[PDB]
Design a binder for this molecule. Structure first.
Ligand SMILES: Nc1ncnc2c1ncn2[C@@H]1O[C@H](COP(=O)(O)O)[C@@H](O)[C@H]1O
Ligand SMILES: O=C1CSC(c2nc3ccc(O)cc3s2)=N1
Length: 539
């Protein structure tokens, strides 16, 4: 089938050994250089590769002495912090699966998520502690809670350093620790949760094989970033999620200084880019607005920044192009993937930007676009459902064989639930989620297309689009808008603006509501259910 698109051979073949073995190999190399692994942008605290490796090795030994066996389970519940990856790396080192969650989960989400992954130990931030304690009342198999981001015991709980001390012999030599080899294709490494799900979280089982494939991509000269000493990357993406998880672990393989930024006011963002001499930034679409509108770019030395990348949700072509222009870059680097595919499976190749494209199929992967009804493959410039196949496909959902079967078909293809197409040169374009399409008469209107028009208006800060039920037409496109501070538009002004830029079918017949915040998930995907509720309210 000439409709199947096949990625090229990786520059660097997948290395032998587990994901833990590969992380140890590379982290050790950078430790001996005296390189910095993590930096908290706002406090300036650094962890060297040496320190980070040592603590991860020591925690690995501590977890074994505690009694965890291969295929045991631990979790994190934490907002981004520079310590986040210590339990991740320790777990990869010893073959104990790690279930990352964020302090920002609701209690309903967290009780469900940890109820699935069943961690013996939870590494909680101080901020997340109350939620973890509450969850433990239901998930009573959680034996131990350790405080991730404290140097001292906190509210009666052992901090990370105390847990290590209490579970390793005095004088223990970290240098003596050995990574545990595992059955690479079968051994669960991580249990992840998607963001912006319409249901409760499912546990996505990712293996060592999945991760070591990502490591080949991350170092790839075309599909990743080249190793270069102590180079700094600014990251704003949630670590507990696949997007932050696998960009960050890839950066550690590459020896980068990971500059973690948790505050998004414009001055902090730009001061961080400048002060840490960041060469790359990895963003969610919302933050492009800041850069496009900023009047302060000129006040900072931003000359080190040579790559701006996006992922997680649709990025307006025109907003991306404007920001790339401001920074005198060819284009925005993009990646598209799902939690269930580990990381990005379509990535902008270096030297192969195409306006609007999400990129090309990554090495070792294949992709196709299928007809929404027949499920047969399509040629170029034909919209349908994107499907992918390759060694980053998850092992399956935890204890949910029905959901696994719905996602990955009898021929091994993962159905992404996303509409897109590829062009004659095989660049893929991702339009929106199938479940998000607005069924106006016989049309299927993608909210992202309307959101892009709205985000181009200089008086609009943010917007989200969803369908309002209608007896005659089925659904009407409607919008929630956050106005820029000091600017005003009426509902009619917004509607008329949109009507001037779009086809008849795409008009905002469902109306416009003004709000302080557009409901979005943790990686920027629009919360349609929440938008529909706002639109329904008499205002
Ligand atoms: N570059 C991208 N452009 C458009 N949508 C994206 C992109 N990357 C991720 N997504 C969306 O995010 C979904 C995966 O979200 P998650 O389940 O949280 O991993 C995909 O199915 C897409 O709908
Ligand atoms: O929804 C998801 C799950 S993993 C992922 C991404 N991973 C990435 C890696 C690099 C990149 O540039 C862009 C992306 S998006 N997006």
């Amino acid at each position: 089938d000439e409709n199947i698109v096949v990625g090229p051979k990786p520059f660097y073949p997948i290395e032998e050994g587990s994901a833990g073995t590969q992380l140890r190999k590379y982290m050790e190399r950078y430790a001996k250089l005296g390189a910095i692994a993590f930096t908290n942008a706002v406090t300036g605290v650094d962890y060297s590769y040496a320190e980070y490796l040592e603590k991860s090795c020591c925690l690995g030994k501590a977890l074994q002495n505690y009694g965890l066996v291969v295929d045991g389970r631990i979790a994190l519940c934490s907002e981004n912090c520079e310590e986040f990856f210590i339990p991740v790396i320790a777990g990869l080192f010893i073959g104990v699966g790690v279930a990352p969650t964020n302090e920002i989960y609701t209690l309903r989400e967290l009780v469900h998520s940890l109820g699935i992954s069943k961690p013996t130990i939870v590494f909680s931030s101080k901020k997340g502690l109350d939620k973890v304690i509450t969850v433990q009342k239901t998930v009573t198999t959680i034996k131990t809670i350790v405080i991730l981001d404290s140097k001292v015991d906190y509210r009666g709980y052992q901090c990370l350093d105390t847990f290590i001390k209490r579970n390793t012999p005095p004088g223990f030599q970290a240098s003596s620790f050995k990574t545990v080899e595992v059955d690479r294709k079968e051994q669960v490494a991580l249990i992840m949760n998607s963001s912006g799900s319409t249901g409760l979280p499912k546990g996505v089982q990712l293996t060592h094989e999945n991760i070591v494939t990502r490591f080949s991509h991350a170092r790839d000269p075309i599909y990743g970033n080249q190793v270069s000493p102590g180079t700094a990357v600014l990251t704003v993406v949630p670590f507990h999620h696949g997007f932050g998880m696998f960009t960050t672990l890839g950066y550690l393989i590459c020896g980068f200084r990971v500059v973690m930024l948790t505050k998004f006011d414009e001055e902090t963002f730009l001061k961080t880019l400048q002060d840490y001499k960041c060469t790359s930034v990895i963003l969610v679409p919302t933050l492009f607005a800041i850069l496009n509108k900023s009047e302060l770019l000129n006040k900072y030395d931003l000359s080190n920044l040579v790559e701006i990348a996006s992922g997680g949700a649709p990025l307006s072509k025109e907003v991306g192009e404007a920001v790339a222009r401001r920074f005198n870059l060819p284009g925005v680097r993009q990646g598209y993937g799902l939690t269930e595919t580990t990381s990005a499976i379509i990535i902008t190749p270096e030297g192969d930007d195409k306006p609007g494209a999400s990129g090309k199929v990554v090495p070792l992967f294949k992709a196709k676009v299928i007809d929404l009804d027949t499920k047969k493959s399509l040629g170029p410039n034909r919209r349908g459902e994107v499907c992918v196949k390759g060694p980053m496909l998850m092992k399956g959902y935890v204890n949910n064989p029905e959901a696994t079967k719905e996602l990955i078909d009898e021929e091994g293809w993962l159905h992404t639930g996303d509409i897109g197409y590829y062009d004659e040169e095989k660049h893929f374009f991702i339009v929106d989620r199938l479940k998000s399409l607005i069924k106006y008469k016989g049309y299927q209107v993608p909210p992202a297309e309307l959101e892009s028009v709205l985000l181009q208006h200089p008086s609009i800060f943010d917007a989200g689009v969803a369908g309002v039920p209608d007896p005659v037409a089925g659904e009407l496109p409607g919008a929630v808008v956050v106005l820029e501070s000091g600017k005003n538009m009426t509902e009619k002004e917004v509607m008329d603006y949109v009507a001037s830029q779009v086809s008849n079918a795409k008009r905002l017949r469902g109306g416009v509501r003004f709000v302080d915040e557009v409901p979005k998930g943790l990686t920027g995907k629009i919360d349609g259910r929440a938008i529909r509720e706002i639109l329904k309210k008499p205002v």
